[PDB]
Short mmCIF file of C-alpha atoms and ligand atoms in Angstrom, two decimals:
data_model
loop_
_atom_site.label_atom_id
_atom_site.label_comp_id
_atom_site.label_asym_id
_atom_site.label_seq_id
_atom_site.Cartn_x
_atom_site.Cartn_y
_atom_site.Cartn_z
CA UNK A 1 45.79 49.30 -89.86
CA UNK A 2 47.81 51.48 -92.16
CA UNK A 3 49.14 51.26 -95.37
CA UNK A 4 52.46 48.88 -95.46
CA UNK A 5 54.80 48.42 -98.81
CA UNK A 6 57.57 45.97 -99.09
CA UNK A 7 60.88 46.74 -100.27
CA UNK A 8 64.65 44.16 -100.30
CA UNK A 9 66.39 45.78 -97.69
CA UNK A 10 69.71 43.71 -96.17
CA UNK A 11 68.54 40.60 -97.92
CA UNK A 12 65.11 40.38 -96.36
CA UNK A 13 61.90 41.67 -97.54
CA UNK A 14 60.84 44.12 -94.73
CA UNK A 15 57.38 45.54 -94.69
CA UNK A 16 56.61 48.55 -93.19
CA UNK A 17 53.98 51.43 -93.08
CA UNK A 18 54.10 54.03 -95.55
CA UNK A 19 54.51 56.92 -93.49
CA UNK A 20 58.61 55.80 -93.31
CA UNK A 21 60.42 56.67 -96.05
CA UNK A 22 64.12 56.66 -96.89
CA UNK A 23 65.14 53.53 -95.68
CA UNK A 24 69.04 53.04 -95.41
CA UNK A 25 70.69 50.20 -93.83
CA UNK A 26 73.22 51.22 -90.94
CA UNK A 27 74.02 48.12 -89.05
CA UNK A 28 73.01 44.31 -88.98
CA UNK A 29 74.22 41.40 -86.74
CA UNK A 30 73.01 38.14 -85.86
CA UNK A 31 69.67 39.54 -83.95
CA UNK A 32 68.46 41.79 -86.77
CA UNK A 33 69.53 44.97 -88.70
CA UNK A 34 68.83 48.50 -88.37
CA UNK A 35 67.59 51.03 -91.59
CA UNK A 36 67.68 55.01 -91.05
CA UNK A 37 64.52 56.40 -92.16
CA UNK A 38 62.40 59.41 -92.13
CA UNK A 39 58.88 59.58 -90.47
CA UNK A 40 56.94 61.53 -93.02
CA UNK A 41 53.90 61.70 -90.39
CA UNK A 42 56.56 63.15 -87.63
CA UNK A 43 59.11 64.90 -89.66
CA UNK A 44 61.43 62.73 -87.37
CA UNK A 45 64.23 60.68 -88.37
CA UNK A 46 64.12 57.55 -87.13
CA UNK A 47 65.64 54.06 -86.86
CA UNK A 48 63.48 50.94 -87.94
CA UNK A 49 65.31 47.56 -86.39
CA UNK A 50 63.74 44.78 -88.23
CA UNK A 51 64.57 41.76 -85.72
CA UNK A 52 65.96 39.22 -87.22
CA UNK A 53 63.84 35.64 -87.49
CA UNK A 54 62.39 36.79 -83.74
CA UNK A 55 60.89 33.23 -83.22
CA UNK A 56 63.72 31.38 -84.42
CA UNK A 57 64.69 29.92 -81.16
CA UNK A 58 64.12 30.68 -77.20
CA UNK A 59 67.13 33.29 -76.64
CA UNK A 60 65.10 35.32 -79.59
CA UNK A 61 62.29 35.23 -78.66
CA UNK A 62 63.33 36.13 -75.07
CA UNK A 63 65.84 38.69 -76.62
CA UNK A 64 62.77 39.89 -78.67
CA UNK A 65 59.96 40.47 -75.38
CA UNK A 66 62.90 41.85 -73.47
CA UNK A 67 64.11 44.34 -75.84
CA UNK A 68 60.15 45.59 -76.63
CA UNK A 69 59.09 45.99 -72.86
CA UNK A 70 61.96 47.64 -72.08
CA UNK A 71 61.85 50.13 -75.00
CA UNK A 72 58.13 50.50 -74.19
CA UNK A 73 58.97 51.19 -70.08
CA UNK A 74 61.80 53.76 -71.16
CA UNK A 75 60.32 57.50 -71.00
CA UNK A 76 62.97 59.74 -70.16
CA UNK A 77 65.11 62.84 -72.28
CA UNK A 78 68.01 60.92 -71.80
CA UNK A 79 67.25 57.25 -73.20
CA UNK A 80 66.38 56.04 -76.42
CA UNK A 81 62.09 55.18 -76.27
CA UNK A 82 60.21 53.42 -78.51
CA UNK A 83 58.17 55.81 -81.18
CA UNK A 84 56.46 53.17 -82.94
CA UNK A 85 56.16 49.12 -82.83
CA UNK A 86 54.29 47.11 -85.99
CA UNK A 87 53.92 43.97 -87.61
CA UNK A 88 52.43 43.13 -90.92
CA UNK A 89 51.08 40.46 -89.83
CA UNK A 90 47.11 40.26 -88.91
CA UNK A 91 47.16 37.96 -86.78
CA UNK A 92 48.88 35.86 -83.95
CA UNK A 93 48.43 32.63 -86.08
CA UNK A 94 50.85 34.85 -88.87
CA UNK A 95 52.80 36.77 -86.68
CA UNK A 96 56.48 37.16 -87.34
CA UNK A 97 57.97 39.29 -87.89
CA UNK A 98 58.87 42.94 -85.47
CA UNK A 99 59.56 45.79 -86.03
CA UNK A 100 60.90 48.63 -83.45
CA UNK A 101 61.18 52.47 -84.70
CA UNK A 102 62.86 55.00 -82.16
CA UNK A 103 64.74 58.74 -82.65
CA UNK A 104 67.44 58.51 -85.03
CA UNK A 105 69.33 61.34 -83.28
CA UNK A 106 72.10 61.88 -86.74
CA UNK A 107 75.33 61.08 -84.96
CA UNK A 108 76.76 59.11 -82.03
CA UNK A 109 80.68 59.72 -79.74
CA UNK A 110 82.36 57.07 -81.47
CA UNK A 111 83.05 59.77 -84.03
CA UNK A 112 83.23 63.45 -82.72
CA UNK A 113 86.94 62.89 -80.53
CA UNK A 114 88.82 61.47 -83.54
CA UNK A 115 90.59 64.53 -84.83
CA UNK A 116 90.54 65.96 -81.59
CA UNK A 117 89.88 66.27 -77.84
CA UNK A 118 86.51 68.09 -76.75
CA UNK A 119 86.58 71.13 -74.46
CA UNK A 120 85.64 70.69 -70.71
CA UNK A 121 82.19 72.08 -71.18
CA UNK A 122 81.00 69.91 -73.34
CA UNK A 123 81.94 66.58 -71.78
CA UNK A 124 80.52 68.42 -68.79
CA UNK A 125 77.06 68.70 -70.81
CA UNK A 126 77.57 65.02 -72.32
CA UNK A 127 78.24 63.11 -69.29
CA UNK A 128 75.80 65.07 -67.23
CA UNK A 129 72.99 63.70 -69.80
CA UNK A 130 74.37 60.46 -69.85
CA UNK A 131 74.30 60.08 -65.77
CA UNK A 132 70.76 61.72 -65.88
CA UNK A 133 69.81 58.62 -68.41
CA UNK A 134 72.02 56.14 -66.37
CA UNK A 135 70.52 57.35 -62.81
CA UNK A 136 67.11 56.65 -64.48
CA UNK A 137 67.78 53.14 -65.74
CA UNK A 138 69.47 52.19 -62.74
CA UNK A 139 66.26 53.55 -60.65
CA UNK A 140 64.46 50.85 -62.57
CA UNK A 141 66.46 47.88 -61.59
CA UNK A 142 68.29 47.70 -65.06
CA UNK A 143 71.97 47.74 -65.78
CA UNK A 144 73.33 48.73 -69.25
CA UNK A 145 76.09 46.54 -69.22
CA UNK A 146 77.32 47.73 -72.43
CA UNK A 147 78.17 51.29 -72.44
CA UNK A 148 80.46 52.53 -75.02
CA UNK A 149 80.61 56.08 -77.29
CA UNK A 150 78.80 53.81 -80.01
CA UNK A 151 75.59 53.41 -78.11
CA UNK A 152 75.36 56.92 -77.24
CA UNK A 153 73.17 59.26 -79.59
CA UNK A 154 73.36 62.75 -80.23
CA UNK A 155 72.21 65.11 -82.56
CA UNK A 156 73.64 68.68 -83.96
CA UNK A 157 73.39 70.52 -80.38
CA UNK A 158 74.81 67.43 -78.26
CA UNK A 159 71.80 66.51 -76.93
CA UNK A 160 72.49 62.41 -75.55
CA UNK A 161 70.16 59.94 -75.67
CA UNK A 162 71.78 55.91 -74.37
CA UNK A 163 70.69 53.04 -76.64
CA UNK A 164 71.56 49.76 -76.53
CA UNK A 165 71.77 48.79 -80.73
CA UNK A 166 72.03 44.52 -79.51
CA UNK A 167 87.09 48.49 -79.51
CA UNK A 168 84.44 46.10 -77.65
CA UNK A 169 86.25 45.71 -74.94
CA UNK A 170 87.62 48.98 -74.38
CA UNK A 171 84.68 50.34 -71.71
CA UNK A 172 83.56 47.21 -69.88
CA UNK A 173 83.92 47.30 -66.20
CA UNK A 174 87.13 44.27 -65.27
CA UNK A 175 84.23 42.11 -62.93
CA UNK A 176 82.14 41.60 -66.31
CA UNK A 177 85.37 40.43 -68.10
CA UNK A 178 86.11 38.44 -64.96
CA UNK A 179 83.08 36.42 -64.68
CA UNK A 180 82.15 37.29 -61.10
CA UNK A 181 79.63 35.30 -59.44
CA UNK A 182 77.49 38.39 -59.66
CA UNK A 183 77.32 42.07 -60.45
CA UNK A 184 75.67 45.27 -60.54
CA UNK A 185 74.98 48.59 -61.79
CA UNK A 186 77.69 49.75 -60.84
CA UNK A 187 79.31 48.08 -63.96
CA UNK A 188 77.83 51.24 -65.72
CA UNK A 189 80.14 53.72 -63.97
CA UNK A 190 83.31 52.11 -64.78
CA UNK A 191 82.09 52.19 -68.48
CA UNK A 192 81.10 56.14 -68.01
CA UNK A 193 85.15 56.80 -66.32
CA UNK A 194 86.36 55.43 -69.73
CA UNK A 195 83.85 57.15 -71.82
CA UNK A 196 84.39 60.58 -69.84
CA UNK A 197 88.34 60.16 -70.26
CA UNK A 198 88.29 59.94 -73.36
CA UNK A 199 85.98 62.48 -74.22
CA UNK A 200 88.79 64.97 -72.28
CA UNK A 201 91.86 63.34 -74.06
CA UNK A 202 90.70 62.59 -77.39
CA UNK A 203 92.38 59.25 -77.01
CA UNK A 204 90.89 55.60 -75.67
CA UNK A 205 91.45 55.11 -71.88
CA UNK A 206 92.31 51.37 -72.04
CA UNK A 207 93.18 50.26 -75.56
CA UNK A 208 93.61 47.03 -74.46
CA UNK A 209 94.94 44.72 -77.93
CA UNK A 210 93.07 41.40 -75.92
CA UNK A 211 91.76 40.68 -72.79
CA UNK A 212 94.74 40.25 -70.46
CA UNK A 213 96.21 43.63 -72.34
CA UNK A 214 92.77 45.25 -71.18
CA UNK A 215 93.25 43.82 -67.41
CA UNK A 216 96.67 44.52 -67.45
CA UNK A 217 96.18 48.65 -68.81
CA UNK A 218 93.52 48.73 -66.23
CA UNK A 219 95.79 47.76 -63.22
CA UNK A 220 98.61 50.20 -64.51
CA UNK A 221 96.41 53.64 -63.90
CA UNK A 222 94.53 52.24 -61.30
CA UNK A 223 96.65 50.05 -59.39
CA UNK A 224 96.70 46.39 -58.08
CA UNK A 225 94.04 45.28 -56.02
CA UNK A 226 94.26 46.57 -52.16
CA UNK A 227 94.38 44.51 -49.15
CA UNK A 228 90.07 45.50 -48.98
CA UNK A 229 89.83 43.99 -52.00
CA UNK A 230 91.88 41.50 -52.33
CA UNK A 231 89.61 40.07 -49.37
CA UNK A 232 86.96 39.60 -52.23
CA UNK A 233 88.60 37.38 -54.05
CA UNK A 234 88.36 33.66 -53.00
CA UNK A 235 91.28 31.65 -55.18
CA UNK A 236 94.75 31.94 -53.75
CA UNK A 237 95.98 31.11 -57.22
CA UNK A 238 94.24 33.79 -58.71
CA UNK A 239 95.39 36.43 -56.42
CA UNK A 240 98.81 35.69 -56.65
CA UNK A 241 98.83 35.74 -60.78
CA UNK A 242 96.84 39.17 -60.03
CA UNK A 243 100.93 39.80 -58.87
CA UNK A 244 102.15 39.39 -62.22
CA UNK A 245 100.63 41.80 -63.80
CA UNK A 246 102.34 44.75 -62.70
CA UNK A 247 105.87 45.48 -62.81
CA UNK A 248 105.97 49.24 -61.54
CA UNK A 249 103.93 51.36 -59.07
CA UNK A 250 100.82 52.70 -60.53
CA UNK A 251 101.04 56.29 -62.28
CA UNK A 252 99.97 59.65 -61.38
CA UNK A 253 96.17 59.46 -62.21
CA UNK A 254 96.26 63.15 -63.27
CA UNK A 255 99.15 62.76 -65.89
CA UNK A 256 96.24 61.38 -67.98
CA UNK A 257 94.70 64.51 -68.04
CA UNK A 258 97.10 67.53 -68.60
CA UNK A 259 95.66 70.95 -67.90
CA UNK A 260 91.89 69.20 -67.49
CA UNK A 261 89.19 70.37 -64.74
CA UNK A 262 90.31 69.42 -61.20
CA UNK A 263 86.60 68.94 -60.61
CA UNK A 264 86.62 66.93 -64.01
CA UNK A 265 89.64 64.54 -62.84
CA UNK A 266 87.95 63.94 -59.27
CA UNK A 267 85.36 62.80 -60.73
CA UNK A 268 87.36 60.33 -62.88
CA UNK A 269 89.14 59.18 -59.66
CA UNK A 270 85.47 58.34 -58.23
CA UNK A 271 84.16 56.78 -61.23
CA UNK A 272 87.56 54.62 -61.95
CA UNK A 273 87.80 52.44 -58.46
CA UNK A 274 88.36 48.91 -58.93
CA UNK A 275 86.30 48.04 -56.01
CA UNK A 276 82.76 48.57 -57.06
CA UNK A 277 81.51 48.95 -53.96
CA UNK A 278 83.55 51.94 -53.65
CA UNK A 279 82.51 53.67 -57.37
CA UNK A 280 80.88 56.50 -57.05
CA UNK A 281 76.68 56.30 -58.10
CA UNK A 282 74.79 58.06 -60.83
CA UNK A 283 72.86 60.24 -58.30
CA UNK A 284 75.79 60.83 -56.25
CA UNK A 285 77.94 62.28 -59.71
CA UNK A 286 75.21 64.17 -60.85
CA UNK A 287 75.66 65.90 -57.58
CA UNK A 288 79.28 66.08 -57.63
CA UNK A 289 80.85 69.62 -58.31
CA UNK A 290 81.85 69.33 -61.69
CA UNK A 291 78.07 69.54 -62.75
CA UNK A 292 77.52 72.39 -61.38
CA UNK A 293 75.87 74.61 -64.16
CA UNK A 294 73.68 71.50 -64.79
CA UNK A 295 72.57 70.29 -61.88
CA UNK A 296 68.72 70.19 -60.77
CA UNK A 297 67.80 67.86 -58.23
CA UNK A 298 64.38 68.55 -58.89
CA UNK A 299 64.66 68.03 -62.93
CA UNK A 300 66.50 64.39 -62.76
CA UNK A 301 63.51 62.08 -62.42
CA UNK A 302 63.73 58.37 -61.79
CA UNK A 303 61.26 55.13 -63.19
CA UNK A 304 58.87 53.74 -62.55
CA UNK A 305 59.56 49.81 -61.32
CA UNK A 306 60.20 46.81 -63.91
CA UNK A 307 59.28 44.01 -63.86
CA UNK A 308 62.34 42.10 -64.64
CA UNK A 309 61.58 38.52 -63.83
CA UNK A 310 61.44 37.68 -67.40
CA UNK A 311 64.96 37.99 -67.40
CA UNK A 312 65.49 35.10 -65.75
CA UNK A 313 62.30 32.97 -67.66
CA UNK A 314 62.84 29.50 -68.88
CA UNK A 315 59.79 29.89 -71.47
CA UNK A 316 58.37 27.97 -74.40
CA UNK A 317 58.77 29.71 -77.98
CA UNK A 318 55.21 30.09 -78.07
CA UNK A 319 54.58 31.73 -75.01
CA UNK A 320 57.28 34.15 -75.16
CA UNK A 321 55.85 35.31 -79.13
CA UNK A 322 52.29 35.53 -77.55
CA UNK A 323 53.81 38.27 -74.31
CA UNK A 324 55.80 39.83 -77.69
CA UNK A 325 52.17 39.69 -79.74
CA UNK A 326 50.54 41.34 -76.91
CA UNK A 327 53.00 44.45 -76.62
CA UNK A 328 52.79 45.00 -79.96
CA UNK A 329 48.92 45.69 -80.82
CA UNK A 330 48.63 47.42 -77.20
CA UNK A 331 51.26 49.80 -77.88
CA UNK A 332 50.25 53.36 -77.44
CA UNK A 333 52.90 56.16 -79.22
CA UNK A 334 53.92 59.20 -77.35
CA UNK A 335 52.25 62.11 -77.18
C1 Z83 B 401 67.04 51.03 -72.40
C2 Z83 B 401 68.39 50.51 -72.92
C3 Z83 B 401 69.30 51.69 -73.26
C4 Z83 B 401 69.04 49.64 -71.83
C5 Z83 B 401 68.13 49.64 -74.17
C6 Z83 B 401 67.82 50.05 -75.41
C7 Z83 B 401 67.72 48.93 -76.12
N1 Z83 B 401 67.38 48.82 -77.43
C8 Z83 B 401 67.59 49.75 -78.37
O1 Z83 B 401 68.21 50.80 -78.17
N2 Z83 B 401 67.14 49.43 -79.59
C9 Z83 B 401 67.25 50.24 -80.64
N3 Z83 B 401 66.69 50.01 -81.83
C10 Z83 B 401 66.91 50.97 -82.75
C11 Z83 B 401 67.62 52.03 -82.34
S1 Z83 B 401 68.02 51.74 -80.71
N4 Z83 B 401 67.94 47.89 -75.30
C12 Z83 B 401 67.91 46.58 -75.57
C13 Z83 B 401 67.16 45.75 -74.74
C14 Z83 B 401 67.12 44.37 -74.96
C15 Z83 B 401 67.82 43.82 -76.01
C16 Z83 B 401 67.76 42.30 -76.24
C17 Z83 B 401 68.94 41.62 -75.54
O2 Z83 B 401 68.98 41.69 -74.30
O3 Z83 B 401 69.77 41.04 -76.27
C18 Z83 B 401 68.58 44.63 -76.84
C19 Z83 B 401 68.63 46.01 -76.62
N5 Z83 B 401 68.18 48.31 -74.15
C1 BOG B 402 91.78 43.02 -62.90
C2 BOG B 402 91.84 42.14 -61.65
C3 BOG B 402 91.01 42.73 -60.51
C4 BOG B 402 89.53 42.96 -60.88
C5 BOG B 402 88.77 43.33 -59.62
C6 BOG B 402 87.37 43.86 -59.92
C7 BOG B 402 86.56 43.98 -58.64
C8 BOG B 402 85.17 44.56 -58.93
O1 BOG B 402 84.48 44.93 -57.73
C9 BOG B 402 83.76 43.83 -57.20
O2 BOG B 402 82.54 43.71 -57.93
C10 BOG B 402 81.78 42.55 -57.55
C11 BOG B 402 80.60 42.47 -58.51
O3 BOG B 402 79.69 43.54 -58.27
C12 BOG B 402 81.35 42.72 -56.09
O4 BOG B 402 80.66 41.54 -55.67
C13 BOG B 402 82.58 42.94 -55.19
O5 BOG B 402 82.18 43.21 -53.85
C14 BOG B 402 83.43 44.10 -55.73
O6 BOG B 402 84.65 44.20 -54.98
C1 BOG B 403 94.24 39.79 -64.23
C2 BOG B 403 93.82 38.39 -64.69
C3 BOG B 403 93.75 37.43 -63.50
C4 BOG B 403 92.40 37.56 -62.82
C5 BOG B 403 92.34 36.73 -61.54
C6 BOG B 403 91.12 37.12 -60.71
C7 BOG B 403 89.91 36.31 -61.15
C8 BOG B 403 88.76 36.54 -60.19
O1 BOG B 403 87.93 35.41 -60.36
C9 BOG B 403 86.62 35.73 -59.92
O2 BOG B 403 86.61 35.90 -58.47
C10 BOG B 403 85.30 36.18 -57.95
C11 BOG B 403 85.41 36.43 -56.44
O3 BOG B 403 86.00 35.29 -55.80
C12 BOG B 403 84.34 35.02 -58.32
O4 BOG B 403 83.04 35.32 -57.85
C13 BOG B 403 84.30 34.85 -59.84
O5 BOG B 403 83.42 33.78 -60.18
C14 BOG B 403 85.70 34.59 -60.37
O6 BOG B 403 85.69 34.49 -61.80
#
């Protein structure tokens, strides 16, 4: 067991091995908060999430087991993994209280595009990572769901690693906002379009001020739903108020993007489909033209399986700390 020291931090008391130093809060919300740090045994910076009262109640401690197996399953240059895992605590019968530590990175997009746009090589080297990550999650049977420049991480030379931390509607695919019946990873793509846009542009794709605004931005650079579409959805009533909410013919797609890549703005067009049957894959873009100085089928490995039943576990508190005590004390760091 190492050394641990205790320290006010966000108005907790968190506890944590002496090897991190610098602690600096950077973000809290009703699951738990997040302290930059520096790993004096790594030379890494880091972030430490404390989770906040993990135990409390069934959706955290689900929240809690999901977030650690998944962090623990993630090995891949392209997503944020899991460096380190404690608790103070000796004990089930005293446990908790978790803590997760992963790469800090230094920066993440929601910053570099505000002064201005980015040239066409870079986006080409930030959304290639960030499809190589994506193709990787997806082979695992997970879907992001919550893309955006804010949970993307990147350090001095651009390198991109996707987190998920747990303007916030801006990159969400219009099926999540719609509450379809289901979905799928596909969801992911729509959210990479908007992300990739406005990488190019320097500006948000769909600034939407609410969520009819967002639907209605959407379906004036896209267009309304086609007839194959339209076949998807079931109300009458729903289709026809679809009707209203376009006055005009839809725009020319590549007015967006003035003087961009025509390799860069076909991809858009594939990404950006309402239909998401019809939206172009993670494999299938990291194949597409555009990444061509990139590219290595043979360097863009997949995961391993997950099991993801827990997702959809109607569990006792108990139990679900026990799974979460488990992970903890047979977590193994990276080599
Ligand atoms: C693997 C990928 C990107 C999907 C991902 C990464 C993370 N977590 C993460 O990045 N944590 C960090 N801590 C410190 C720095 S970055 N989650 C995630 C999983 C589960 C839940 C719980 C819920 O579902 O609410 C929350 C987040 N998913
Ligand atoms: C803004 C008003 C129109 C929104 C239409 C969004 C259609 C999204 O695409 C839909 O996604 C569903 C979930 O994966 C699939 O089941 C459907 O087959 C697919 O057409
Ligand atoms: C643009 C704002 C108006 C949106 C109207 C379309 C709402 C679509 O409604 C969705 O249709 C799906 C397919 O039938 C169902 O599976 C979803 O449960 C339903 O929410």
């Amino acid at each position: 067991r190492p050394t641990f020291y205790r320290q006010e931090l966000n108005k907790t008391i968190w506890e944590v091995p002496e090897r991190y130093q610098n602690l600096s809060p950077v973000g809290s919300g009703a699951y738990g908060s997040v302290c930059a740090a520096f790993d004096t045994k790594t030379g890494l910076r880091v972030a430490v999430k404390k989770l906040s009262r993990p135990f409390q109640s069934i959706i955290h401690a689900k929240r809690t087991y999901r977030e650690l197996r998944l962090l623990k399953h993630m090995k891949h240059e392209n997503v944020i993994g899991l460096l380190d895992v404690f608790t103070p605590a000796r004990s089930l019968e005293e446990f908790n209280d978790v803590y997760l530590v992963t790469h800090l990175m230094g920066a993440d997009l929601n910053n570099i595009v505000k002064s201005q746009k980015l040239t066409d090589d870079h986006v080409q080297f930030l959304i290639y990572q960030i499809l190589r990550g994506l193709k990787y999650i997806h082979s695992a049977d997970i879907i992001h769901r919550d893309l955006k420049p804010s949970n993307l991480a990147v350090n001095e030379d651009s390198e991109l690693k996707i987190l998920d931390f747990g303007a916030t509607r801006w990159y969400r695919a219009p099926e999540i906002m719609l509450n379809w019946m289901h979905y799928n990873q596909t969801v992911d793509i729509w959210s990479v379009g908007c992300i990739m846009a406005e990488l190019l542009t320097g500006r948000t794709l769909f600034p939407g001020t609410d969520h009819i605004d967002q639907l209605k931005l959407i379906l004036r650079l896209v267009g309304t739903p086609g007839a194959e579409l339209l076949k998807k959805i079931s109300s009458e009533s729903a289709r026809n108020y679809i009707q209203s909410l376009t006055q005009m013919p839809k725009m020319n797609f590549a007015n967006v993007f003035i003087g961009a890549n025509p390799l860069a703005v076909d991809l858009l067009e594939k990404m950006l489909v309402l239909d998401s049957d019809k939206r172009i894959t993670a494999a299938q873009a990291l194949a597409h033209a555009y990444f061509a100085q990139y590219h290595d089928p043979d360097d863009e490995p997949v995961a391993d399986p997950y099991d993801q039943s827990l997702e959809s576990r109607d569990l006792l508190i108990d139990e679900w700390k026990s799974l979460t005590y488990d992970e903890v004390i047979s977590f193994v760091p990276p080599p």
